[PDB]
Amino acid sequence: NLYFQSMSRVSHEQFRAALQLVVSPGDPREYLANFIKIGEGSTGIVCIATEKHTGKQVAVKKMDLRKQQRRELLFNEVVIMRDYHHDNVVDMYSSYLVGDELWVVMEFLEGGALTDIVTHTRMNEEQIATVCLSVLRALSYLHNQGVIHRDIKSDSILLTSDGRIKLSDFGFCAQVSKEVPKRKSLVGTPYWMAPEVISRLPYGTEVDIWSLGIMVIEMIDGEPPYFNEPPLQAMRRIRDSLPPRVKDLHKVSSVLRGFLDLMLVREPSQRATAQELLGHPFLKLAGPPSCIVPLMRQ
């Protein structure tokens, strides 16, 4: 009968101590040099540095711990990035505390986000299949470890300079287990959220498959369904309406329509799993990284 207070209530020093148990010890400025800022706000800053031992370029996200309003999501995120690694997930090399800052040392990807592509170009089905295959491989791995991303959208998909596709931004992720197999939290970016999450029903890894389907509609039509409406209004339609369809059915192949139909299924138990989707004929259309390069802004 001792009450331990929630992470939002503890001292800044004990928030930091919590993080100290899960980050790498020491000071990364020992092995990193030549920091150049490339992004900012609102919690911190992003820099490119050069590893002194190797000359390798890395990205370092520096976040002010006193500005973190979602302390527990950050804590949970740091553990996931530490423990899970996959070629289609932006890799965290190591994390550290420097004063009141969390330094996250990440792989440096120079190809921008998928959002820039879907808002300015028209992807072909080969290119769509390539993105889907990459994301589904990441999800295959993550879902098998009980990790739910919860925030799949074009904005969170980053590209290497040579056209490889990587899932990023695990700020909203969750980990389920045999003991706690489902989550209940209302988390995500409105237009991409699964109906069961919006209904506040217990949910698992299946929510990422719905969100993926919405991203496929982004890649087809340029925006997710109901993007012209206010987010809370869009959420009501997701929760209560039949699954969204593409604008022009006749301009999407039978195989891609079938793939989409397996993902945008309201009942989670009837929705395809990442494992099942990897065997879908649509993904036999996937190409090499070179097929993505012509889409990129440069």
Author numbering: -6 to 0, 425 to 715
Task: Quote the authors verbatim.
PAKs are serine/threonine protein kinases that are regulated by Rho GTPases of the Cdc42 and Rac families (Knaus et al., 1995; Manser et al., 1994; Martin et al., 1995). In humans, the PAK family comprises six members, which are classified into groups I (PAK1, -2, and -3) and II (PAK4, -5, and -6) based on their domain architecture and regulatory properties (Bokoch, 2003; Jaffer and Chernoff, 2002; Kumar et al., 2006; Zhao and Manser, 2005). Group II PAKs (PAK4–6) regulate a wide variety of cellular functions, and PAK deregulation has been linked to tumor development. Comparison of five high-resolution crystal structures comprising the kinase domains of all three monophosphorylated, enzymatically active group II PAK family members revealed a number of catalytically productive and nonproductive conformers presumably representing snapshots of catalytic domain movements during catalysis.
In order to elucidate the molecular mechanisms of inhibition, we determined the structures of a 2, 6, 9-trisubstituted purine inhibitor (N-(cis-2-Aminocyclohexyl)-N-(3-chlorophenyl)-9-ethyl-9H-purine-2, 6-diamine) with PAK4 and PAK5. Interestingly, PAK5 crystallized with two molecules in the asymmetric unit; one molecule was found in a noncatalytically productive conformation with an unoccupied active site (apo-PAK5), and the other bound the purine inhibitor and was in a closed, catalytically productive conformation. The detailed mechanism for the group II PAKs was best highlighted by the structure of PAK5 complexed with the purine inhibitor. In this crystal, the asymmetric unit accommodated two molecules, only one of which had the purine bound, allowing the comparison of a catalytically productive, inhibitor-bound conformation with an open, catalytically nonproductive apo structure under identical crystallization conditions. In PAK5, the phosphorylated Ser602 forms a hydrogen bond network with Arg600, Arg567, Tyr620, and Phe589. This hydrogen bond network links both ends of the activation segment via the catalytic loop residue Arg567. In the PAK5 inhibitor complex, the last turn of the αC helix is distorted and becomes a loop region, thus adding length to the αC–β4 loop. In contrast, the N terminus of αC gains an additional turn with the rearrangement of the βC–αC loop. In the PAK5 purine complex, the αC N-terminal extension leads to the formation of two hydrogen bonds, between the conserved αC Arg487 and main chain residues of the glycine-rich loop residues Ser459 and Gly458, respectively, as well as the formation of a salt bridge by the carboxyl group of Glu457. In the catalytically nonproductive PAK5 apo structure, Arg487 is disordered after the γ carbon.
